[PDB]
Amino acid sequence: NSMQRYSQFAVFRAIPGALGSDRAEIVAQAQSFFDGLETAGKVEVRGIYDLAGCRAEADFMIWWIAEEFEEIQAAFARFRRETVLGQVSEVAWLGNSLHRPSHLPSFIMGEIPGDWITVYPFVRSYDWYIMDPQKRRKILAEHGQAARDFPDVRANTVPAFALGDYEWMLAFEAPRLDRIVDLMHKMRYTEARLHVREETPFFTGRRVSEVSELVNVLPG
Amino acid sequence: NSMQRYSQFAVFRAIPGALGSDRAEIVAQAQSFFDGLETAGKVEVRGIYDLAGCRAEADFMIWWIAEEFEEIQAAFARFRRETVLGQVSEVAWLGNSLHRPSHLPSFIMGEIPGDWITVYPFVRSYDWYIMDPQKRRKILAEHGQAARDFPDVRANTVPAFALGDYEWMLAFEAPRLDRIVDLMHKMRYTEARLHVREETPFFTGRRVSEVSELVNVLPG
Amino acid sequence: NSMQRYSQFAVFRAIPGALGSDRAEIVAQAQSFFDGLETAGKVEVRGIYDLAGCRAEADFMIWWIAEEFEEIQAAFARFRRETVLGQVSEVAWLGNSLHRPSHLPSFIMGEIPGDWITVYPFVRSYDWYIMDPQKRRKILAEHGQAARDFPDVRANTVPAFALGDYEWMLAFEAPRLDRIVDLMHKMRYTEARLHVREETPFFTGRRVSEVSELVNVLPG
Amino acid sequence: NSMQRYSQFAVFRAIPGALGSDRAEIVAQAQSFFDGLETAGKVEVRGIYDLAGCRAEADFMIWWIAEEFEEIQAAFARFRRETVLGQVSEVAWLGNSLHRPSHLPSFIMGEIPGDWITVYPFVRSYDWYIMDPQKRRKILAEHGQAARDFPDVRANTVPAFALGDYEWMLAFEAPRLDRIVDLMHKMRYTEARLHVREETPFFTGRRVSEVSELVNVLPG
Amino acid sequence: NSMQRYSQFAVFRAIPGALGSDRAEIVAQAQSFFDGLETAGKVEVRGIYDLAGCRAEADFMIWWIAEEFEEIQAAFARFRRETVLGQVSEVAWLGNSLHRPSHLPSFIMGEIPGDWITVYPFVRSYDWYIMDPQKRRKILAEHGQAARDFPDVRANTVPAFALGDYEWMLAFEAPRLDRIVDLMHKMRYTEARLHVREETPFFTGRRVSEVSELVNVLPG
């Protein structure tokens, strides 16, 4: 541990009729942008995800992590400004979180990202934090134990206070989507469900190897 | 059973002034797209439904089922990309569910789809799943018995965790719409109503024989 | 009784700058459409109401009743498709209900529609239907007694399950609007108010004699 | 008082880029419209209020009162139809109320309107009206007594049942805005706060002497 | 102190495709506008903040304070009217507050603004103000003690009654964003959390030295 890492799930919705039918130059420009980000060494793009078919207001997602938040701001603004892909898309939702130095987030461990991801914000009940620490730790122990049968699903739980309307950001990565569905269904059977205020919206996506795969399927 | 099937209710809203008045080529292209989907053998389009007059933000719906979710993603993106019908429509709502290996969904049995359908998402109360299994099973038995007076209405209840903001997807198919209305009204008289958080939005539609019947009624 | 009738309150909002200033041909076309509906004998247009000044997102309303819901769907689609008035308007809200075979809705009796109408959907509490039938009957008797001092206000309470997000559709018709306001205010003084979940949005309008009166006041 | 008066707070939001930079003719036309309203003698425009800086979706407000509601409808439609100012604005919110024949609204007395106004709708709790009349009258007496230290703030509480989604319309007029802020803060210290369901949105504005002052500040 | 100061957090969202690529003249015009505001001596612009990456519907924010609210209205309208930057932006959210003459807001003391800010509205529970003053003051003392471990984060709590939909405006200024995140997380561990109704939306931003730095990063 002992590392500071802001994380961002930037969710974009494609504007129909704006991308056009000739997309080779757009693909090349977006790929050059991401290669420049990678060679700069400040912002690490953990993944690019196709959100088609998940919900009506989202089309794709970029999950990237940087040591400072201003670097994420610069990368996000540059993506929206200097690339055609960012110019023909609307920002639908932004999930920001900060990891500060037991169990650590999967992206902190450096694990290989899974094929499928689900991402959602999380807000606990008002009395959750002032609850007796004995009871809170027991509830959290049961909640964690409920995920013992899913070693293939990696979980990221990162604090998100003051970086949005939420308190935590949760991200599940799995080779198969049905494993994520089963994990959520089984986690419904826990006492921690009694201390939940907000858990929406959900964003479920498939990791693409390169930006060309994403661009070639966007509408318009 | 012993087969995995993802299901999707893709709801689209027609943009006024975009379809135009000459629709023969649009009809032919949409029919060719659906015939190609059928001949590919991966995605099975269970139905196409006209949602006109049900609610303000919906115009039609496609109910299709595939073994893998990426196939549904590909079909959905292709519909929005390579057909004029998908290019002049906005995605209003997406209801995703996964059926995994009692009483099984109607589309799992392969029953003939009914003339009328009603589709809605469903979210249970926070304490529903950690409730005493005896009490939950008794409540579910009463809820099921309340629907034994409507043998002509087929019910699909499919888990929807992590595939959206919801927990279950419910679909009722009947030859007559008044049967669905009566079933919902009678199902209001059950104890399970005490454990409901979200059940909206509703989408009520009539099954069309072919895409031409749907296209010829959409607003110009 | 012994008659099945679906009812629809189709609420439309006028798009500014689309109707124009020359409206004689639009008036003639809309009148021809409504005369064709009347002469077809399937859909009965009970009223056309001007909603200007009631709320921000509504401009007028068509209240029509038909034996089958397919006929209402067809008439609604035809209005939105083959008339300039329907082409330059957006659907803001749709209230659907079904009357099936005590006290009957005013439109079932065939009473002359009042000059002023108010319309809203209604959703009861979760425990309303499983409440002890004696207590529910007493509450409903008190609620009905509260409306005995307003014989000039006719009330239509029609089930709306599965035809939208609601449970009941309520419509009050009166020669004067202050009578409706007083009736609602006095009905606030009832125990049934303890079993209400949703009762919005409201749509208050004045019945117009012919579509020309409505068209000549819509924003250009 | 033996007078019937409907009151309306019509809130409009200016469309950027539609008003233009040359506004003398627009000012003259709007002033002519309001002079015609005053001459006709049916609708009394109590005030015109600049709402800039109060909230994102509002730009100005017209507060007008008429004996019949159809007169208000005609004036509102005419403003949106036959004036450039009404043609380049969107209706953001409409607050309607009816005053029917103790303490009466300020506009019934005909008091000089204050420089600053705040306006909001109000919805009481479900059990407020069936509460024991002694307890309700005691609560209302305390609530009224809490406003003894603000004689310079005039309050208008008018029933709003069936004329929208609300129950009451509340308007506070003061020479200074800080007096309104202090009054609201002091009214927070009352038992009536335990019986409140809805009190938003708020509209705070400054009374303008003539429509030219309002038009000259709207965004181009 | 005896200083009466209205404060405003004007949040703007940039319209894509409206700013263009040549921004030198826009920068010069905006800088001239802000220099004129500073010279006039009525409205003091406390800060300009880049909000990119915080949320989907916000792009930047202006925090300015003036003795009278009409001066803030004039400055806001003038910014939206006479500058290209204000003409190519939409108002997303407005947070207004009034400070009337223990512990004072940071902007009242004149402290140097921090590099990072987090701004949100706040609404207490209905029974918060009529709670026993002993208990309320004890809860507030504990809440204040919870923030004594963060001397580097300056807090501004200003009443916001009748100037919007909220009750208080809260702003946290820090040299580092992680300090704000930690302060919010630690403040979750207080009894005052039991008396919260609304605390969203949040606006987290980085203070820019000049308007050129802000304009050069906005999407084209």
Side-chain angles (χ1 to χ4, degrees), chain C residues 77-90:
Chain C
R78 202 152 71 85
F79 178 72
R80 292 188 69 201
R81 198 177 59 245
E82 302 183 6
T83 66
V84 178
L85 185 55
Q87 275 152 31
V88 303
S89 299
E90 318 167 9

PDB file of all heavy atoms in Angstrom, chain C residues 77-90:
ATOM      1  N   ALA C  77     -52.252   6.745 -32.551  1.00  0.00           N
ATOM      2  CA  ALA C  77     -51.209   6.750 -33.569  1.00  0.00           C
ATOM      3  C   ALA C  77     -51.630   7.560 -34.787  1.00  0.00           C
ATOM      4  O   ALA C  77     -50.821   8.300 -35.356  1.00  0.00           O
ATOM      5  CB  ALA C  77     -50.860   5.319 -33.970  1.00  0.00           C
ATOM      6  N   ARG C  78     -52.891   7.431 -35.203  1.00  0.00           N
ATOM      7  CA  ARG C  78     -53.372   8.182 -36.356  1.00  0.00           C
ATOM      8  C   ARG C  78     -53.375   9.678 -36.077  1.00  0.00           C
ATOM      9  O   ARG C  78     -53.055  10.479 -36.961  1.00  0.00           O
ATOM     10  CB  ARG C  78     -54.767   7.704 -36.744  1.00  0.00           C
ATOM     11  CG  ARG C  78     -55.142   8.001 -38.175  1.00  0.00           C
ATOM     12  CD  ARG C  78     -56.142   6.993 -38.692  1.00  0.00           C
ATOM     13  NE  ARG C  78     -57.454   7.178 -38.087  1.00  0.00           N
ATOM     14  CZ  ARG C  78     -58.364   8.035 -38.527  1.00  0.00           C
ATOM     15  NH1 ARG C  78     -58.137   8.804 -39.579  1.00  0.00           N
ATOM     16  NH2 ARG C  78     -59.532   8.121 -37.897  1.00  0.00           N
ATOM     17  N   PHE C  79     -53.743  10.076 -34.859  1.00  0.00           N
ATOM     18  CA  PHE C  79     -53.689  11.487 -34.501  1.00  0.00           C
ATOM     19  C   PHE C  79     -52.260  12.005 -34.553  1.00  0.00           C
ATOM     20  O   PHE C  79     -52.003  13.104 -35.057  1.00  0.00           O
ATOM     21  CB  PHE C  79     -54.283  11.707 -33.113  1.00  0.00           C
ATOM     22  CG  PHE C  79     -54.214  13.130 -32.652  1.00  0.00           C
ATOM     23  CD1 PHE C  79     -55.024  14.094 -33.219  1.00  0.00           C
ATOM     24  CD2 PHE C  79     -53.327  13.507 -31.663  1.00  0.00           C
ATOM     25  CE1 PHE C  79     -54.958  15.403 -32.799  1.00  0.00           C
ATOM     26  CE2 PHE C  79     -53.256  14.816 -31.241  1.00  0.00           C
ATOM     27  CZ  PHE C  79     -54.071  15.764 -31.809  1.00  0.00           C
ATOM     28  N   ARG C  80     -51.309  11.221 -34.043  1.00  0.00           N
ATOM     29  CA  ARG C  80     -49.922  11.673 -34.062  1.00  0.00           C
ATOM     30  C   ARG C  80     -49.298  11.610 -35.449  1.00  0.00           C
ATOM     31  O   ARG C  80     -48.282  12.268 -35.685  1.00  0.00           O
ATOM     32  CB  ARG C  80     -49.082  10.851 -33.091  1.00  0.00           C
ATOM     33  CG  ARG C  80     -49.426  11.078 -31.642  1.00  0.00           C
ATOM     34  CD  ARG C  80     -48.428  10.386 -30.747  1.00  0.00           C
ATOM     35  NE  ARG C  80     -47.111  11.003 -30.809  1.00  0.00           N
ATOM     36  CZ  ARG C  80     -45.987  10.398 -30.454  1.00  0.00           C
ATOM     37  NH1 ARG C  80     -45.984   9.149 -30.021  1.00  0.00           N
ATOM     38  NH2 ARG C  80     -44.839  11.063 -30.534  1.00  0.00           N
ATOM     39  N   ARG C  81     -49.873  10.837 -36.367  1.00  0.00           N
ATOM     40  CA  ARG C  81     -49.259  10.598 -37.666  1.00  0.00           C
ATOM     41  C   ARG C  81     -49.855  11.439 -38.790  1.00  0.00           C
ATOM     42  O   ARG C  81     -49.114  12.068 -39.548  1.00  0.00           O
ATOM     43  CB  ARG C  81     -49.380   9.112 -38.017  1.00  0.00           C
ATOM     44  CG  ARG C  81     -48.449   8.641 -39.106  1.00  0.00           C
ATOM     45  CD  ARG C  81     -48.597   7.151 -39.326  1.00  0.00           C
ATOM     46  NE  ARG C  81     -49.960   6.789 -39.695  1.00  0.00           N
ATOM     47  CZ  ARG C  81     -50.763   6.039 -38.954  1.00  0.00           C
ATOM     48  NH1 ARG C  81     -50.376   5.560 -37.785  1.00  0.00           N
ATOM     49  NH2 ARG C  81     -51.985   5.765 -39.396  1.00  0.00           N
ATOM     50  N   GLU C  82     -51.180  11.462 -38.920  1.00  0.00           N
ATOM     51  CA  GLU C  82     -51.841  11.979 -40.110  1.00  0.00           C
ATOM     52  C   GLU C  82     -52.471  13.351 -39.912  1.00  0.00           C
ATOM     53  O   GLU C  82     -53.228  13.799 -40.778  1.00  0.00           O
ATOM     54  CB  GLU C  82     -52.903  10.987 -40.582  1.00  0.00           C
ATOM     55  CG  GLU C  82     -52.359   9.606 -40.880  1.00  0.00           C
ATOM     56  CD  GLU C  82     -53.422   8.666 -41.404  1.00  0.00           C
ATOM     57  OE1 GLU C  82     -54.555   9.127 -41.648  1.00  0.00           O
ATOM     58  OE2 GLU C  82     -53.125   7.465 -41.569  1.00  0.00           O
ATOM     59  N   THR C  83     -52.191  14.029 -38.803  1.00  0.00           N
ATOM     60  CA  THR C  83     -52.689  15.379 -38.583  1.00  0.00           C
ATOM     61  C   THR C  83     -51.527  16.300 -38.252  1.00  0.00           C
ATOM     62  O   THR C  83     -50.588  15.901 -37.558  1.00  0.00           O
ATOM     63  CB  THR C  83     -53.723  15.436 -37.454  1.00  0.00           C
ATOM     64  OG1 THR C  83     -53.093  15.109 -36.211  1.00  0.00           O
ATOM     65  CG2 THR C  83     -54.859  14.469 -37.715  1.00  0.00           C
ATOM     66  N   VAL C  84     -51.595  17.533 -38.755  1.00  0.00           N
ATOM     67  CA  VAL C  84     -50.557  18.512 -38.452  1.00  0.00           C
ATOM     68  C   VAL C  84     -50.568  18.854 -36.968  1.00  0.00           C
ATOM     69  O   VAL C  84     -49.515  19.084 -36.363  1.00  0.00           O
ATOM     70  CB  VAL C  84     -50.733  19.765 -39.328  1.00  0.00           C
ATOM     71  CG1 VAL C  84     -49.694  20.813 -38.978  1.00  0.00           C
ATOM     72  CG2 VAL C  84     -50.639  19.398 -40.794  1.00  0.00           C
ATOM     73  N   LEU C  85     -51.754  18.883 -36.358  1.00  0.00           N
ATOM     74  CA  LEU C  85     -51.849  19.172 -34.931  1.00  0.00           C
ATOM     75  C   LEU C  85     -51.110  18.126 -34.107  1.00  0.00           C
ATOM     76  O   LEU C  85     -50.433  18.461 -33.129  1.00  0.00           O
ATOM     77  CB  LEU C  85     -53.314  19.249 -34.511  1.00  0.00           C
ATOM     78  CG  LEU C  85     -53.583  19.659 -33.064  1.00  0.00           C
ATOM     79  CD1 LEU C  85     -52.905  20.977 -32.752  1.00  0.00           C
ATOM     80  CD2 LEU C  85     -55.073  19.749 -32.807  1.00  0.00           C
ATOM     81  N   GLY C  86     -51.236  16.853 -34.480  1.00  0.00           N
ATOM     82  CA  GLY C  86     -50.512  15.812 -33.774  1.00  0.00           C
ATOM     83  C   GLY C  86     -49.037  15.774 -34.111  1.00  0.00           C
ATOM     84  O   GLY C  86     -48.229  15.287 -33.317  1.00  0.00           O
ATOM     85  N   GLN C  87     -48.664  16.279 -35.286  1.00  0.00           N
ATOM     86  CA  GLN C  87     -47.267  16.293 -35.696  1.00  0.00           C
ATOM     87  C   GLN C  87     -46.460  17.389 -35.015  1.00  0.00           C
ATOM     88  O   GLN C  87     -45.239  17.252 -34.892  1.00  0.00           O
ATOM     89  CB  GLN C  87     -47.166  16.454 -37.213  1.00  0.00           C
ATOM     90  CG  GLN C  87     -47.264  15.150 -37.981  1.00  0.00           C
ATOM     91  CD  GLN C  87     -47.833  15.339 -39.370  1.00  0.00           C
ATOM     92  OE1 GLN C  87     -47.648  16.382 -39.992  1.00  0.00           O
ATOM     93  NE2 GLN C  87     -48.526  14.324 -39.866  1.00  0.00           N
ATOM     94  N   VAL C  88     -47.103  18.466 -34.575  1.00  0.00           N
ATOM     95  CA  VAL C  88     -46.414  19.588 -33.953  1.00  0.00           C
ATOM     96  C   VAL C  88     -46.601  19.586 -32.438  1.00  0.00           C
ATOM     97  O   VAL C  88     -46.406  20.610 -31.788  1.00  0.00           O
ATOM     98  CB  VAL C  88     -46.861  20.924 -34.567  1.00  0.00           C
ATOM     99  CG1 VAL C  88     -46.620  20.925 -36.063  1.00  0.00           C
ATOM    100  CG2 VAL C  88     -48.323  21.190 -34.261  1.00  0.00           C
ATOM    101  N   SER C  89     -46.972  18.447 -31.863  1.00  0.00           N
ATOM    102  CA  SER C  89     -47.184  18.325 -30.431  1.00  0.00           C
ATOM    103  C   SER C  89     -46.385  17.148 -29.892  1.00  0.00           C
ATOM    104  O   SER C  89     -46.111  16.185 -30.611  1.00  0.00           O
ATOM    105  CB  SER C  89     -48.667  18.135 -30.101  1.00  0.00           C
ATOM    106  OG  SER C  89     -49.429  19.242 -30.543  1.00  0.00           O
ATOM    107  N   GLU C  90     -46.011  17.238 -28.621  1.00  0.00           N
ATOM    108  CA  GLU C  90     -45.347  16.150 -27.921  1.00  0.00           C
ATOM    109  C   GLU C  90     -46.320  15.519 -26.940  1.00  0.00           C
ATOM    110  O   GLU C  90     -47.164  16.206 -26.364  1.00  0.00           O
ATOM    111  CB  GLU C  90     -44.110  16.638 -27.166  1.00  0.00           C
ATOM    112  CG  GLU C  90     -43.260  17.630 -27.920  1.00  0.00           C
ATOM    113  CD  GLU C  90     -42.249  18.317 -27.025  1.00  0.00           C
ATOM    114  OE1 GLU C  90     -42.107  17.896 -25.858  1.00  0.00           O
ATOM    115  OE2 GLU C  90     -41.597  19.276 -27.485  1.00  0.00           O
TER     116      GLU C  90
END
